[PDB]
Design a protein around this ligand. Sequence first.
Ligand code: HEM
Length: 180
Amino acid sequence: MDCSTNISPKQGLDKAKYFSGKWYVTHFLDKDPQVTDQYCSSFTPRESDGTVKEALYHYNANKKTSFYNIGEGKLESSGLQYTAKYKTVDKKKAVLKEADEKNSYTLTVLEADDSSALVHICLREGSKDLGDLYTVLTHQKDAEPSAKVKSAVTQAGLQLSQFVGTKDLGCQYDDQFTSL
Ligand code: HEM
């Protein structure tokens, strides 16, 4: 597998709209999943002098288990795009593994407004691309994405209908973990 190539951040986006609130994934598009388990995710991204830190949460909807990470990276010269190394933590944010130099993700923001966003994420380990994911995001669980963000899905060459909708998965979030 190869992460999608035509990916660059939309220019003219207002970063205070992305580094805002918390995000819940309402729809995801996973190109070549190595597992069949489907997940829910929420994260809280903050930025300061070009360094991003974000608490990251995954819920396995089949096994009904959750795992936790903290990402850190630097904004690119191109705009709202950053490559993040990440720690592995427990629900109390105790560090189980420090960030290393082989594991990272690149996050690119394709659209972001007052209520919603579209972002792309390539997860990598050493020389291999592990996962390519598009995610539609809202600020509350199960809120409808904006017409603008829906338009950006189609602009990106995609069909929203072909994403997995997370509402039917029976998601469970930990809003204490994502807070702050
Ligand atoms: C609902 C949306 C998402 C889905 C379906 C999803 C799915 C997955 C899956 C299946 C894995 C591998 C789990 C394993 O077998 O260990 C994973 C790992 C990971 N994801 Fe996501 N993910 C989502 C959202 C996100 C987002 C928004 C971010 C970044 C902000 C992110 C960052 C990561 C990272 C860093 C890992 C590596 C964790 C590790 O190696 O322990 N994910 N995700």
